[PDB]
């Protein structure tokens, strides 16, 4: 078997291979002289004469390589210690603690002393630690497991969210860190739409999508991706909105569902609000520094515009020359899209949590929050004329004073109905009664 | 200066330690591997982990 021999040739150093290379023409030339029947003496004297080599060495090596085939002649020319201590050390390093090697080793020395174990050299120990596995380190921290056709413009869009590090004073006066959801065209990388709000919830996604399909339309083959590899909650309209299934609406749009920090967060105008990744940051300065919602949102819109308009984008489509806007304007004109009807757009208007319907076929929504306070009562004959107890109300905040649309709890449209700080005081009082009691318990 | 309530049910104590040190005849001037990282505490020490699950620790 020439496998072990050739692996020995292979594993040899460059210097060793060079040595074999140097020794090969001398052995081969020698073979020629003997074939001619030249005296061994004259042949070796001649080779040792022309080539600087010991005649005896050449002779000996020739006989050694004689038994080997000629193509392989080159390849021819080329810790006992206590397992308990070793196990103890390995056991120690693999702990999530992951102590320093030299110190863990010293501890091991103490244990070895107590048990009388014969330990190997620190260098040997660590060497063997390297020899263990890439997987073992992960075994200690569970780390690696945490890592592990033609596309038209508008054909495939990706949705992503972003939590801002900038403090903004919102429309309701509260100072918060806004969260914005963005829709991006996968091919051209152009941002097609966005919506910003006080927290992460479906509304910003839904409405940014609405912005995207209203502005650019709905393609005939529509793919949407949100990599997850429901929001709702009370009551910005004083009535709760909403536990639903957005999923159905997306599938209905004819969409197949799949599962700037420099421009916004780092813009000069917000410098008092953005703190930066500062581990130590004084909280005493910031209540005054929080920027206005209008300024933040304007800076955001301009940041998006500048991100899209930025040339020198290194992508296939831009070829290091054009901007996302250029390639989007170019490719969008080569795709076939359809505009959404008024009805479709209205079906996307916001869902209110189920309200009770009386025997008379009327129900109530207590309007408030960002809208003018009022207790709206809606009515229709179809509500009293068939089976219903609870009903989901779909509405446009701007049209609450006139027409809403009632749906059954399972989603079937029934008919439309015509129209015939509050809880924050409790929230604040609760806050004070917390803080005072908390300080009193701390002391 | 420390102090605060009351480990003996009565409060201890606003004082001046400084005087006591000067009285001792002292002129006043103004292991993480061995403790925090020891194997026996591995359930409690979390390590400088930026993301660490709070659900495990009450038991640890």
Curated annotation (Swiss-Prot), chain A:
Residues 149-350 are annotated as: Catalytic. Residues 351-443 are annotated as: Target DNA capture and bending. Keywords: DNA excision, DNA integration, DNA recombination, DNA replication, DNA-binding, Early protein, Host cytoplasm, Hydrolase, Latency-replication decision, Ligase, Magnesium, Metal-binding, Nuclease, Transposable element, Transposition, Viral DNA replication. It is found in: Host cytoplasm. Mg(2+) binds at residues 160, 227. Changing residue 160 to V: Loss of DNA-protein assembly. The catalytic domain contains two distinct activities, the cleavage and strand transfer activity and the flaps endonuclease activity. The N-terminal HTH Mu-type domain 1-alpha is responsible for sequence-specific DNA binding to the IAS. Two adjacent regions 1-beta and 1-gamma bind to the ends of the viral genome. Belongs to the mulikevirus repressor c protein family. This is DDE-recombinase A. The gene is A. The chain holds residues 88 to 594 of 663 of the full protein.
């Amino acid at each position: 078997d020439r496998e072990a021999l050739w692996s020995k040739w292979d594993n040899a150093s460059d210097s060793q291979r060079r040595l074999a290379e140097k020794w090969l023409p001398a052995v081969q030339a020698a073979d020629e002289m003997l074939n001619q029947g030249i005296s061994t003496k004259t042949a070796f004297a001649t080779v040792a004469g022309h080539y600087q080599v010991s005649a005896s060495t050449l002779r000996d090596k020739y006989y050694q390589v004689q038994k080997f085939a000629k193509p392989d002649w080159a390849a021819a020319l080329v810790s006992e210690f206590d397992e308990d201590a070793w196990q103890f050390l390995i056991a120690d390093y693999l702990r999530p603690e992951k102590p320093a090697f030299r110190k863990c080793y010293e501890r091991l020395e103490l244990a070895a002393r107590e048990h009388g174990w014969s330990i190997p050299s620190r260098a040997t120990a660590f060497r063997r630690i390297q020899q263990l596995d890439e997987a073992m380190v992960v075994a200690c921290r569970e780390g690696e497991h945490a890592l592990m056709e033609h596309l038209d413009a508008m054909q495939w869009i990706n949705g992503d969210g972003y939590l801002h590090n900038v403090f903004v004073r919102w429309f309701n006066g509260d100072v918060i860190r806004p969260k914005t959801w963005f829709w991006q065209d996968v091919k051209t990388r152009k941002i097609l739409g966005w919506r910003c709000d006080v927290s992460e919830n479906i509304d910003s996604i839904r409405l940014s999508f609405m912005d995207v399909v209203t502005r650019y339309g709905i393609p005939e083959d529509f793919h949407i991706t949100i990599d997850n590899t429901t929001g709702g909650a009370p009551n910005r309209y004083r009535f709760k909105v909403k536990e639903d299934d957005p999923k159905g609406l997306f599938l209905l749009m004819g969409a197949k569902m799949h599962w700037l920090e420099e421009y916004v967060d780092k813009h000069p105008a917000l410098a008092g609000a953005y703190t930066g990744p500062n581990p130590q940051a004084k909280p005493d300065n910031y209540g005054d520094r929080a920027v206005d919602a209008e300024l933040f949102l304007k800076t955001l819109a301009e940041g998006v515009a500048m991100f899209n308009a930025r040339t020198g984008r290194e992508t296939e489509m831009c070829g290091g020359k054009l901007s996302f806007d250029d390639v989007f304007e170019r490719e969008y004109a080569r795709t076939i899209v359809r505009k959404p009807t008024e009805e479709q757009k209205r079906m996307l208007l916001l869902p209110a949590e189920a309200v009770n319907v009386s025997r008379k076929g009327e129900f109530t929504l207590k309007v408030g929050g960002s809208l003018k306070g009022a207790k709206n009562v809606y009515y229709n004959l179809a509500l009293m004329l068939a089976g219903v107890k609870k009903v989901v109300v779909r509405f446009d905040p701007q049209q609450l004073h006139s027409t809403v649309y009632c749906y059954t709890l399972d989603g079937r449209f029934i008919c439309e109905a015509e129209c015939l700080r509050e809880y924050r005081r409790r929230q604040k009082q609760l806050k004070s009664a917390t803080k005072a009691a908390i300080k009193a318990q701390k002391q």
